[PDB]
């Protein structure tokens, strides 16, 4: 049927790779593709590369432009939704406000929406993943950095400056490690790929025994969070001390999100989450310590179900605001 | 009978008086009245008195049910919004489930909604007080307990079990005092009228130098929070220490709300907020320490501006759900 010919495009713009998908309006992925993110020359090539990659795909496959209901994009930094504008994407070399919506919509002639990259991932997990289309879902992504998205009373939250959802920068330890954001004791300092290592680098001195994990940490290895958790599951007394510390802080931060927002679920995604049930459990355990009874007995600690496709899926969902009603 | 000019009713049910207002749908006050709260007989007279007072008023003003979009009520107790019931408002003697929404609609034929005190105070300040009607406003109320409400993307938040906005039970110290709720180090534990005093009586013992605050505690006087704030305002060195502490915790909690929700404002109200700028400015200092720049330099700390009128105006706004 003619409804089944409609398509939406999602863009997942990351510091290293830009991923695209074409999906049905029900959010089933029809095609995926990617390119490198060119950050050279103050990142002026990024938006043209995205425009070019979409023009070429449409042309390559002789696609019908009017099948497309619209394009949704997730981007690093903070987004003014009304403006279609991106500020704070320093990792991209955008030091100045970027009129991304204007450029793409203009170039492509198909309606465009954009949002922050974890925000859009949050929408993806709500729509097709662990969020289960609940009106109240918090997404937290642990990878290179710590990011998040909040859907509350059915809507994605942005706040006054587009910074709602920034849970990586919740202070879990007023006396903790220096964060790049410019304060100390952010969740991100203790829970990103790099934060877990840092927590392990500093607990090492509190462990008089030896273990395969302690040896590699002490040697200067940047062991993945996955490997750290795997040593823990496998019984490594040092890995178990590090995981314990890490999930304490994730439990405090997610707990206080539960206490304030009471979402149906907090969904944990990103690379670390491959660690699976062993991580979900330890997070849930400290979440339980830190939450009041009504929140304990209602808000659930979940793992992401979509892996790295949540971005393109969530981004795509922003395009649905353009459907003919 | 002008359908282009319907009105909303707000009700603020307190333990001693019940406040009413009629507003236009834009929230301009047309009429305010109050009656006392009769709690005798397990609180069984309260909703009939409200109905009577509203019926009578409707009759005075030659109004009819069709001139009203709805009625909203703020109440203490444990509320189920969907059902429209209340339970556990012990200052009301409401120890059994009160079918408030049934009583109201079945007597008045005007649609009714209800919510908790704090939430409705939040709606008020967001709409007509310090929130300036911005879509993202967090209100927190300091007093005998710590309570709150959050408006985000223009909607009050309730969460899946109706607990959203419960700021007083955010963990500010993983190893702090025992909270009534069952866990340690809840904000309520340090920043309620009772919490402030708790902090004073727990630091005095280490402090040695001279302060009128410390001598009074050590005389055996029943020190209050307005008293602690009093003494610090006069320069009492130990009392400033206790305020610093309370504000550190308040900074952290509001700071983290700032980091997760980035509202245009965090509005601080209730009894402890009587200290005014003396309070606000210390809270803002720790809020700044605990936020990252983009939030630090957008979300504002503000004092509540409506005082005791926030409740009735925010309760009126519940009625707007029934428009058209
Ligand atoms: Mg986000
Ligand atoms: Mg509330
Ligand atoms: Zn930070
Ligand atoms: Zn508590």
DSSP at B177: P
Taking a C-beta distance cutoff of 8 angstroms, is the pair A92, A76 a contact?
Answer: yes
DSSP at A195: H
> How many Å from the N-terminal Cα to the C-terminal Cα in chain A?
17
Same-domain pairing of A236 and A247: yes
β-bridge pairing B78-80 and B85-87: antiparallel
Q: Cβ of B162 under 8 Å from any chain A Cβ? A: yes
Question: CA B94 to CA B46: how far, in whole Å?
Answer: 10
Measured between CA atoms, the residue of chain A closest to residue B184 is A290
CA-based nearest distance A22→chain B, Å: 29
Same-domain pairing of B142 and B247: yes
Same-domain pairing of A114 and A227: no
Same-domain pairing of A93 and A171: no
Q: Cβ of B170 under 8 Å from any chain A Cβ? A: yes
Question: CA B3 to CA A312: how far, in whole Å?
Answer: 47
Same-domain pairing of A268 and A202: yes
Question: CA A207 to CA A286: how far, in whole Å?
Answer: 22
Same-domain pairing of B110 and B196: no
Query: Positive or negative CA dihedral for B33, B17, B69, A261?
Result: positive
β-bridge pairing B137-142 and B265-270: parallel
Same-domain pairing of A204 and A299: yes
Question: CA B187 to CA B251: how far, in whole Å?
Answer: 10
In the numeric block, which tokens belong to residue A175?
A: 């006396």
For residue B168, the chain A residues in CB contact (below 8 A) are none
Question: CA B231 to CA A295: how far, in whole Å?
Answer: 38
In the numeric block, which tokens belong to residue B25?
A: 């749908």
CA-based nearest distance B152→chain A, Å: 7
Q: What approach was used to elucidate this structure? A: X-ray
Q: Cβ of B155 under 8 Å from any chain A Cβ? A: yes
User: What is the dihedral angle through the alpha carbons of A260, A173, A269, A276, rounded to the nearest 10 degrees?
Assistant: -110
- A31 strand-pairing partners: A22
Same-domain pairing of A164 and A74: no
Taking a C-beta distance cutoff of 8 angstroms, is the pair A146, A192 a contact?
Answer: yes
Same-domain pairing of B252 and B140: yes
Domain count, chain B: 2
Is B166 in contact with A260 (Cβ distance < 8 A)? yes
Question: CA A258 to CA A255: how far, in whole Å?
Answer: 5
Alpha helix positions (H), chain A: 46-60, 100-108, 117-128, 188-191, 193-203, 212-218, 225-233, 237-261, 277-289, 293-296, 310-318
Question: CA A299 to CA B161: how far, in whole Å?
Answer: 8
Same-domain pairing of B162 and B270: yes
In the numeric block, which tokens belong to residue B31?
A: 């009429």
Of B170, B262, B289, the CB nearest to A260: B170
- B22 strand-pairing partners: B9, B31
For residue B159, the chain A residues in CB contact (below 8 A) are 136, 152, 261-263, 295, 298-299
Alpha helix positions (H), A262-276: none
Question: CA A83 to CA B54: how far, in whole Å?
Answer: 46
Same-domain pairing of B159 and B182: yes
Residues contributing to the annotated binding site of A for Zn(2+):
169, 179, 181, 186
DSSP at B98: B
CA distances, A313 to each of A6, A74, A89, B10, B315 (Å): 15, 10, 21, 43, 39
Same-domain pairing of A210 and A139: yes
Question: CA A67 to CA A2: how far, in whole Å?
Answer: 9
B25 three-state secondary structure:
coil
- Hunting for tokens 């965090």 — which residue is that? B266
Domain housing B152: 133-305
CA distances, A142 to each of A321, B171, B205 (Å): 29, 22, 43
How far is Cα of residue B232 from the mean position of the Cα atoms in its chain? 25
- Overall size of chain B counted in residues: 324
CATH number of the CATH domain containing B235: 3.30.420.40
Question: CA A69 to CA B54: how far, in whole Å?
Answer: 51
Q: Cβ of A165 under 8 Å from any chain B Cβ? A: yes
A40-49, Cβ contacts within 8 angstroms, sequence gap of 24 or more = A40/A93, A41/A93, A42/A93, A42/A94, A42/A95, A42/A96, A43/A89, A43/A92, A43/A93, A43/A94, A46/A13, A46/A18, A46/A92, A46/A94, A47/A98, A47/A100, A47/A103, A47/A104, A49/A18
Longest CA pairwise span in chain B (Å): 72
Longest CA pairwise span in chain A (Å): 68
Question: CA A310 to CA A28: how far, in whole Å?
Answer: 12
């Amino acid at each position: 049927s003619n409804a089944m010919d409609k398509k939406i495009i999602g863009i997942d713009l990351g510091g290293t790779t830009i991923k695209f998908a074409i999906l049905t309006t029900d959010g089933v992925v029809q095609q995926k593709w990617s390119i490198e993110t060119n950050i050279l020359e103050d990142g002026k090539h990024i938006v043209p590369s995205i425009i070019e990659s979409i023009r070429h795909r449409i042309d390559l496959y002789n696609m019908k432009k009017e099948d497309f209901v619209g394009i949704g994009m997730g981007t690093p930094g903070s987004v003014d939704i009304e403006k279609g504008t991106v500020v704070g994407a320093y990792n991209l070399n955008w030091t100045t406000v970027q009129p991304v919506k204007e450029q793409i919509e203009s170039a492509l002639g198909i309606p465009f929406a954009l949002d922050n990259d974890a925000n859009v991932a949050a929408l993806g997990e709500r729509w097709k993943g662990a969020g289960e289309n609940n009106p109240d879902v918090i997404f937290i992504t642990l990878g290179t950095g710590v990011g998040g998205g909040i859907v509350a009373a059915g809507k994605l939250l942005h706040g006054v400056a587009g910074c709602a959802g920034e849970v990586g920068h919740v202070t879990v330890d007023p006396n903790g490690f220096d964060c790049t954001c410019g304060k100390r004791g952010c969740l991100e300092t203790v829970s990103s790929a790099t934060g877990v290592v840092r927590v392990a680098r500093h607990l090492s001195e509190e462990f008089a025994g030896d273990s395969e994990l302690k040896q590699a940490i002490d040697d200067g290895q940047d062991v993945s969070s996955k490997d750290v958790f795997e040593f823990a599951e496998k019984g490594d007394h040092f890995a178990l001390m590090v995981v314990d510390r890490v999930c304490f802080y994730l439990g405090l931060a997610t707990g206080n999100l539960g206490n304030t927002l009471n979402p149906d679920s907090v969904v944990i995604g990103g690379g670390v989450s491959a660690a699976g049930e062993f991580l979900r459990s330890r997070v849930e355990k400290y979440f339980q310590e830190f939450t009041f009874p009504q929140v304990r007995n209602s808000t659930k600690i979940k793992l992401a179900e979509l892996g790295n496709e949540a971005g393109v899926i969530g981004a795509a969902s922003l395009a649905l605001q353009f459907s003919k009603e």
